[PDB]
Each structure stands twice: as C-alpha cells, then as structure tokens.
Amino acid sequence: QHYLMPLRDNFEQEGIRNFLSPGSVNMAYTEYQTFILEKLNALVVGTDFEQKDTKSIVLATARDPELAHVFNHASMAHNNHFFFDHLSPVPVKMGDKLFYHINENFGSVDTLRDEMIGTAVSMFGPGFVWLVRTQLPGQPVALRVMATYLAGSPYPGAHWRRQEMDAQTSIGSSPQGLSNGQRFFERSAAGFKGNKLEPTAPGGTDLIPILCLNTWEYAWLREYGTGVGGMGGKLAYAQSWWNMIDWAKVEEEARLETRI
Amino acid sequence: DEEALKLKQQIEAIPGNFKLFKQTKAQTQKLGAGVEVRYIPEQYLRNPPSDASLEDLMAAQAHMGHNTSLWNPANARYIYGVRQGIHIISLETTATHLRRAARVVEEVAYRGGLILFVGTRPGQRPIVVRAAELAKACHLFTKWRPGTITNREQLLGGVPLTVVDELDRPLSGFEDHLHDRRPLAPDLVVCLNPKENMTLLYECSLAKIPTIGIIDTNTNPSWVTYQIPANDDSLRATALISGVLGRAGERGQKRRLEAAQRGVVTWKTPADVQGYFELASARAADARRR
Amino acid sequence: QEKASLIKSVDWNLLENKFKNLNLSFILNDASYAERNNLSELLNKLYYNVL
Amino acid sequence: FKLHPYARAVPVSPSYFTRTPRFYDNYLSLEKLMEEYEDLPVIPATAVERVAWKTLEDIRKELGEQVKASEFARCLALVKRLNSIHPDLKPQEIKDVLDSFRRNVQPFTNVAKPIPIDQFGRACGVGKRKASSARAFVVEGTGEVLVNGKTLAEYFGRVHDRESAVWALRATNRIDKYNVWVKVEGGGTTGQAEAITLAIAKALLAHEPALKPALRRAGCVTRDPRKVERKKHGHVKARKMPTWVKR
Amino acid sequence: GKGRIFQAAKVYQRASEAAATNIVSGLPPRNPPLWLKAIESIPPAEINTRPYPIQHSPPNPRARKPRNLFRPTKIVYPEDELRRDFYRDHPWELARPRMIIELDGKDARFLDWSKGLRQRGIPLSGESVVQRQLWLMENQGMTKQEAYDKARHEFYKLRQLEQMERRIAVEEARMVGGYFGKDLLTVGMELENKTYESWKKWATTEIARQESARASMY
RNA sequence: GGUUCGUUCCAUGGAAUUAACGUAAACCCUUGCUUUAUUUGUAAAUAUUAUAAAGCAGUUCACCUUUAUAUAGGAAAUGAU
Ligand SMILES: [K+]
Ligand SMILES: [Mg+2]
Ligand SMILES: [Mg+2]
Ligand SMILES: [Mg+2]
Ligand SMILES: [Mg+2]
C-alpha cells in the first residue's frame, strides 16, 4: 500500500518560516496527501498498480477512460509532493548557469516571475503551474511555462490528460473560439484513432518538469485568507512562494548542457 | 534517401537519450509517495531467505497438493485436508522438514562434502545454478544421464579434477594421482523433482548416498532420505526451498573456511587420496635406500 | 574430436596461395615489402633456415 | 617437500555431472551477461550487420562435446540478441564473447578463363561428346561452314546432324552472320555433330556474351556426360547377364 | 513387482558398517566418507505409517463398521455456506477479476471486520461481505438473514460511488481539454468485424460447395 | 513420434553410456574449370585438340514450402551453374 512519507526539511513539524505556518503545511500535506493516498489505496488495492509508484500509475493510467478517476488521485499526490520538494527553509541564490539561460528564454528573472504568477490568477481555478524544459533533436534546450488544470501531468507520456485549456471559455464563436475548437477535436480524433499529432522522443525526455506551483484552494485559503482587500490572498501566496524556490535544486534537475 | 537517413539520426541519438532518460528517472521517480513493495517475482534469487516461515510457504503455494485421485496413500502423513479437489499439505509439516534438510545441507558443506543440486524442469535452471553458487556446489538442469554414478568410470572419464586443501586452493604435486583416480560422486543430492527422475535417486540409494527431495502428494516418499513435503509443480516454492538450502550450504562453507584459518580442519583426507599418500611414501622410501 | 570432420577453407599460408604469381620478376620488384630485393631474404620468410 | 597433510579432490567446473560440462559453462556465462546488460537498447533486426555464426558441428568439434541441437538453437538466440545492442553502448566483454562464435570459412574460388578473340577475329570454342573434341573458329562471316575441310552436306549425310551442328547459330538466328571452321576428331556421326554444337556455342558467346540465356534454353550449353559403360566380368555387356538356369 | 528396492533410509546404517573395518583384515580402516559425520545426529523421519488423519467434521456416530478411516477429510468452514449464498445472489460479481496470488501471506494481520467492509490489503468483493456478515452474526448475535442484509447493503453503496466516479471522471476531464483512447465498447465491436468477415468467407465457400455437390444428385 | 537415399538426423524412454567391423566417407575411371608440360602428338598460332601430374567443384546459391519450432523438403527444356 502507498503510505505517506516525510517532507524535505522537517516542514511538517516546523514549516517554512515566512511562507506557510506549520499548521497550514499540516493541513496542506499531511492531512491532504493522507486523504488522497487513502482513496488511491482503495482503488489499486487489488490491481497491478498495488505496488507501482505514483508516476508509473500516472503514465500508465492515462489514456484509458475506465481508469480516469485513478489518474486524478495518483497525479495529484505526485504533483503535490513535487511542489514541496522544491522549497527551502531559507531563500537560495539563483545559479549562474541557470540565471543566464533563463534570461535567454524569458528575457529576465522578473519577466518569468510575473508570467507564472500572472498565469496563476488568470486561471481562476485549482491547477498546477510548471516550469518545463523543452528539447528537440537539433533545437537547443529551451525553457517554457505550462499551466495544468486540476490534475494535469506535464510529462509527454501523459499528453492525454495535460488539461492545458479550459474548454468552457476557450471555445466560442469568435475567431479564437473556432481555432481552439479545431485543436480540441483534432487532439481527440487523433488520440482516439491512435495517431500522433506531435512526434516525441522515446523515453519522454522532450519535457522535464523542473519547478511546480500548487494553486489549489486548500493550500493557501488558510494562511493568506480569502484575499478580500488585496491584503494577502491567492496573489500574495504566489508572490511569497517565489522567495523560497530552491534554485540550487532547480538547477540540478534542469541538467543544462554546458554552453558557457 | 530521407527515409534511410532518419534511421541513422535515431541510431546516433540512442546513447544521448538513454543517458538523459536514466538521469530523469532518478529524481522524478519515488516523489509522490512511499510504496510498500512486499513481493517481487525475482526475490528468491537476488536475496533468498535464511529460513522460510509459514507465510512464505503458503505465499509460494507450497501446500497445493495434487488431485485427490492422483495421490499416494503412503504419504498421507503430511496431508492436512481436502479442498478444491486437491490435497492440502500441512504448512507446519513442510517447515519442519525444510529446516531439518537445511541443517543437513549445512553440515555436509561444513565437512567438505560435495553437494549436487538437481532441478530438471523448464524453468528451474536459474534456481539451481543460483543455489549452487551460494553453496559452492554442482548444478544439474538437464536429463540425468542414466549411469553417471554406478558407471562413472565411462561417463565422467575425461572431465578434469583438482586437489585442494584446508583453504580450498590447489596443491601442486598430485599430477600422477589425477589420472588413475576414478571420477567423483556427490556426497549429497538435493533434488527438486523426485517424481520425474527416479533413476538418479535409485543410484544414490544403490551407492549409499544421502538425498533430499521435494515430495509432492503423488510422489513416493521412500525414494529420498530426507523428504520435504511441498508442491513441486510450483516455480515459486521451488525457488524458496532451493534458496533456503543454498543459504545453508553458504553458511556451512563459511564456518569451514573460518575454522581452516585457525588451523582446525573439519575433515580428514578421503580414503582414495589417503591411499596415494601411503604409496607416495613407499616410492619415496626406495629413493632413500637407493 | 578424432571423429570430427574438417571444413574446407582456403589456407592462405600455403606457398601456392601466398604468391599466385610465382615469377621472381614480380615478387622481388617491391610489390609490397621494401628493401627485401635479395632473393635469400625472401626464402627465409618462407622456409626455416638452419644456418 | 612432502604432500599436504589434508587434501581432497574437487571438480574444476561446477557443471561436473552435466551432459556437456564445457558447453553449459559457456552458455551460463551468456545468460549471466543477458541479465545485467539486458536493459541496454537494441538495434532493429534489418540494421544488424550480417554475421556468419558457427554451426552445430563446429562447436561440437572445438569443445569436444555432443551438445544437443535444440540446446544450441536457444544458445544462438542469446548471441543474436546480445549482438543487437548498440555498438557504441555495447561493452567490451560482450564484444570479446561475440568473436568466438564467428565462422571464419572461405570457399574456394574457381574462375574460368574467358575465351579471347584473335587479332583476325576468330574465337575458339571447344566441345566434346562421348569420344570427340571439336574446335570451332567463328568469325564475322556470311554463313559458310566447313567441317574438317569439307562442307556440311559432304561431311554429314544425315540432315538431322547438319541442323544440330550449327544449332547455336540457328536458335539465335545468326546463320548468315558467322563463318565457322571446325575440326573434329573421334566419335561417330552424331557424336561429332553434338560436339560441334557446344563448340560453336562457347565461341559464339565470346562475340556476344548476352546470348547465354537464350542458348541455355536452346540446349547448347550443357555438356552431356553420358558415356558408354564398360563391360563387367560375368556380364555379356555392361548390364546384360547370361541365361540364369534355375534348375 | 514393477518397483525397485529403495534403501535411501538406510544409507547411514549401510555406509557406517562398511566403514567400520577394512577389507584387508589386519589394517586400520580407511577414513569414511565426508558426509558420514555430517548426518550422524540427524536420523531420517519415519515414513509410510498411516495415522488417523485430522477430522475436520464430526465423524458419523451411527456407523458401526466405518470405512476410509485413514482418508483425509474435507475442509469446510462456516464461510463456505455464506459464500455460496451470496455469489448465487450476485452471479455477475464473479466477472470482477480477483487475484489469488499472495504477495507475502501477511494479509490477515490487518483485517478488523468490526470497522466495516473496507479493509487494508484486500479489495471490496464478496468475501469482505461474508467475513463482515459472519462477524455481525457472531459478535452482535444477529441472524444469518439480518447480518446478510446489513453488510450486503453497505456493499452496494460502496459500489455505487465507484461506478459514479468513472462517469464523472471522464466527463469532467473533457471540460478542461482531456482526450482518451478507444473505449471498450468501440474496441469490442471492431474485433467482431474481423471475426464476422471471416465467417462470411467460410459461409460463401461452403455454400458454393453444396451447390457444386447438388449437381451430382441429378 | 517425425525425418532421411540410409540406425541419416531431431526429439524422447522409471537406464543408458560406448568400441570394432559393415555402412558412410575416401579411392579408381568419367564430367567442367584452374595451373603445369609441348615430343614421337597438334594446319596455323600469342595455344584451343591430344597426352597426364596436382588442385577446385553441387544441391552450392536463388525461389517455394515447412512439425513439437528441435531435425527439413519440393520444383527438373524456359532461375544461376
Ligand atoms: K556397346
Ligand atoms: Mg508434482
Ligand atoms: Mg538411445
Ligand atoms: Mg615434334
Ligand atoms: Mg585438357
């Protein structure tokens, strides 16, 4: 059975000093991850996934509709803990190599700062904001930002459940509406028939999620409050989170090719 | 043209992709939650257990006897009951006999005995070879050639031998003895399917050699010296039983070598090699006088 | 091994297969080796010399 | 100087009681390499360079054992499987193990010498039939055939033989484009005529080597090896036996 | 006698005596086999001794001349009766695959049926209902039918939510741009096409066969 | 139980593992080709008959089919030779 594991740097007992109080982290991870895992266990209590890791379940249990509900819990548990394994008790100084490459893809550290934060509030829904490292056979390593609705896997092997666009407000009668509509059907028709829209390298190495940001309500609704009056709120939650990013660990997962 | 060139670029990109794919598999995997992996198919080979508990024996289907009709009333001493139309071998009866046999394998290996692990079935080759490595014994995963013990002079005529000592290292000076010496015979046979090969077990009893076998519900328990009532048709129980016996030999070999480093040999020269020493002194005596 | 058969393969160590043009005007005319013009040296590379 | 006080005989190879000790030891080694390097990627079958692996007999001789064909068939699969590994990623160990299964045999080469063409333009073909050996000198003539100095009608009285003598020119419809001067010796009437057929065929090919597929189907390329059988003692002829009296 | 005289139980006795004295009378006996001392203090177990087997059910007290006294008896538990009843009331519960491959055998250590149907390590199936039923019937002194009703009803509610999640999962997933593969319904129909076409060929052939076979009757 | 011209070959048997002879292989004649030799044989000749020493060559390759996946076979004037 899947069981809850400790956090990175004893955040369960102490929590981040200036980002999330210990009580908030308790309700955000210990009292939520346990709930998700409890449900997940009951689902895979007697299937092949009884001993598979979360990621393996995510990728494996993606295309199949009959197991959609299993993907949610497995993916949510993964993304949730993926979001806590990138914070740090004290702010870390951005690495030089990483600092340079960021400016080459986003123009500045602040340009990307306001993009991820802006994307969060723009969504107006629970989701995860990622930082993905794109790479193609001949194209150099290029970074980009991705938004995943509810439980969305940023990996290319889980393209079926990427959930990058809310079909409610993104498909209308306007010129953009029709364009978004075609893509929506093009993906469904392709996936259903088994055709591949965008070629991906074997092993799912094209995209590597480096950093994540959990925008779900339970995470920030307690410490920062409803946000009425702009004091605190979801906006402040994203801002404060930007100060605890463990840029050192972020650089490691980036695995940028030496080009300096 | 372009179709063939594509294959080239791919074949030239596998090394780079493999390295990157391996690195990415490290950090990403294990992040979501701790899995409680409590069973792996190849766990009885990578790390077999020292002793097998009732749970291990029941989890490996070591109690599924054969159909009620195809039974041997002789071995009704181990049957527990009847369910699903088959005889259920008592779990405790298996564990008791298994621990006993494990003690036999250990002592025989502790006294410098030559053990032979015999499993002759489609998927028993890796199990027997692994057990032999641990116990430093001989393996056999094919049809036992009839007459390799009673007629060893012919069958095992050309196979080479060697002479070792306390610390299992060659002894130069026995060149003349390794040509008149007759082939060896196993000091202990550990069969994993006595029902199949009865010609081997008969030569053991005919040559006064102890044997260990996995007696099923339809196997005659009078063929082997030490019985291990269990399910022989299961590749998962056979790996467990063999693993336990392999660790026994390993533990036995360890004690022997530990006692040899202290100048305490736990075995005296065999009768065959003993005779050579007597002849050696006789030939040497002539040189002294002459 | 005593009863095992032999496969038929070109033995390129045979004096007939080594040099297919036995004329000395071609073997000693700097075909492949250098400064072995002497006939005696060539023979030594083919037969065991006792002297 | 004397022997060690304690000593005991121990088998060298662990597979001491197996059918083929030397073979299984080498086979288990492969299986041991197919368990730690089995995760390395592979190459498509059609992209694997062709290797002439050893045969069952070769292994039997080099090992001195009687390895079973079935067991060797499954051992060869490991070689093919371990050979599909990417060369750059393939380890040195497997490489050393994959060179002992290669078959270094080279069949003998016997290239026949092509028939030249004289300065004046005559090709000399040779044919034989049952006693004879013809020598046809084919030039770019106009259809005048001379057999042993005489013409075709003065030498062969049977029109069946005249046609078969120059059949090569008739099948390819070149009777009026070549002059043939043949010299035949030995054999009878038809024996010599058939010999001239194969002779003109070979000579004609020297000028136009592209006619062999047609001559193949016309029956002017095969050397009929049928030969008069010898008389055997006890027999009236090659096979005829004297009257066997039962009583 | 198609059998052979096995003496595997006397290898030590026979070997020990052979190594007692030398064949050349007037010499010290040579060293015995290396295994003789290893199994010296480990005699073989007794075999071929038909005991009174374990009686898993009360033997017929009326039988005056009972037979098959040395025959193992059948193992019957109180659950067997309940399992038969439930699975007969829910035959399509057998189509739900159930794994009988034990992982480590320690699955009955965390089963506490006082809590409810849901347990650690085992899936929600008919067995959980039976064990829960048996618990209520024994501890809470309920009747077979009463305990059956209670536990059975809990089984339904847990299965209802499971089926509702599937529908709501796929539906909600498409609201945010989520596409899936071929459903089981579509796949099933495709396979029938390949099989139905094969039947058409066979039918056409045999039909033509009979037609040609009918020309010979006249 | 299959297979093969053949106790050949593969598989298998609660008994097999081997040796000698026969078989097979090899040899003699014969067939194509390569090299060597040119008289007493060959019209000429830069060598092609003949003469005779050694060497190579086949069911080899191609096609088709094929069992238990272990051992293979078919086709014969219109694949090569
Ligand atoms: K005749
Ligand atoms: Mg059995
Ligand atoms: Mg036989
Ligand atoms: Mg002359
Ligand atoms: Mg000639």
DSSP string, B215-246: --TTS-TTSSSEE--S-SS-HHHHHHHHHHHH
Is residue B211 within 8 A of residue B191, CB to CB? The reply is yes
Cβ distance B31 to A78 less than 8 Å, yes or no, reads: yes
The Cα E23–Cα E17 span in angstroms is 12
- The residue of chain B with its CA nearest to that of E57 is B81
Q: Chains touching chain E at 3 or more Cβ pairs under 8 angstroms?
A: A, B
The Cα A94–Cα A248 span in angstroms is 7
Task: Give the best residue of E176, E185, E189 to mutate against chain A (max A CB count within 10 A).
Answer: E176
* H helices present in chain E, as ranges: 11-18, 78-89, 126-139, 144-174, 184-214
CA closest to F79 C1', residue: D213
CA distances E137 to B61, E75, E119, Å, are 32, 21, 19
- What angle do helix axes A109-123 and A233-241 make, rounded to 10 degrees? 150
Instruction: Identify all chain E residues contacting A123, using CB atoms and an 8 Å cutoff.
Output: none
CA of D218 to the centre of ligand 1 (A): 29
B20, B30, B37: residue with CB nearest A205: B20
CA distances D211 to B205, D128, D167, D202, D207, Å, are 79, 21, 13, 10, 10
In Å, what is the separation between the CA of C37 and the C1' of F42? Answer: 41
CA of D228 to the centre of ligand 3 (A): 47
Ion ligand 2 neighbours (CB, 5 A) are: B 216, 232-233
Using the structure block, give the residue that is written with the tokens 């590379």. Answer: C45
In Å, what is the separation between the CA of D63 and the C1' of F72? Answer: 26
**Counting beta carbons within 10 angstroms of the beta carbon of residue D68, is it exposed (0 to 12), middle (13 to 18) or buried (19 or more)?**
middle
What residues does B164 pair with on adjacent strands?
D8
Residue A168, token pair as written in the block: 């409610």
Using the structure block, give the residue that is written with the tokens 């040296």. Answer: C41
Is residue B252 within 8 A of residue B107, CB to CB? The reply is yes
Is A162's Cβ below 8 Å from some Cβ in E? yes
The Cα A156–Cα A202 span in angstroms is 10
- What angle do helix axes D21-36 and D56-63 make, rounded to 10 degrees? 110
Cβ distance A63 to E123 less than 8 Å, yes or no, reads: no
Instruction: Identify all chain E residues contacting A66, using CB atoms and an 8 Å cutoff.
Output: 166, 183-184
State the DSSP H helix or E strand holding residue D171, giving kind and residue range, or none if neither.
Answer: helix D167-171
Resolution in A: 3.1
DSSP labels, D42-61:
B--GGGSPP--BPPHHHHHH
Amino acid at A31: E
Is residue D182 within 8 A of residue D134, CB to CB? The reply is yes
Amino acid at C15: L
Instruction: Identify all chain B residues contacting D6, using CB atoms and an 8 Å cutoff.
Output: 165-166, 265, 267-269
Q: Chains touching chain D at 3 or more Cβ pairs under 8 angstroms?
A: B, C
CA of D116 to the centre of ligand 5 (A): 17
**Cα–Cα–Cα angle for A121, A122, A123, nearest 5°?**
90
- Way the structure was solved: cryo-EM
Is residue D63 within 8 A of residue D20, CB to CB? The reply is yes
How far off is chain B from E15, nearest CA to CA, in Å?
6
Instruction: Identify all chain B residues contacting A137, using CB atoms and an 8 Å cutoff.
Output: 9, 13
CA distances C49 to C24, C41, C44, C46, D138, Å, are 20, 10, 6, 9, 54
Chains A and B touch (3+ CB pairs under 8 A): yes
CA distances D119 to D115, D116, D146, E76, Å, are 13, 10, 21, 108
D7, D16, D88: residue with CB nearest B163: D7
Cβ distance E181 to A64 less than 8 Å, yes or no, reads: yes
Instruction: Identify all chain A residues contacting E172, using CB atoms and an 8 Å cutoff.
Output: 150
C1, C4, C8: residue with CB nearest D108: C8
Which-ligand-closest: CA of B145? 3
Task: Give the best residue of A5, A38, A58 to mutate against chain B (max B CB count within 10 A).
Answer: A5
Virtual CA dihedral for A180, A185, A191, A197, nearest 10 degrees? -50
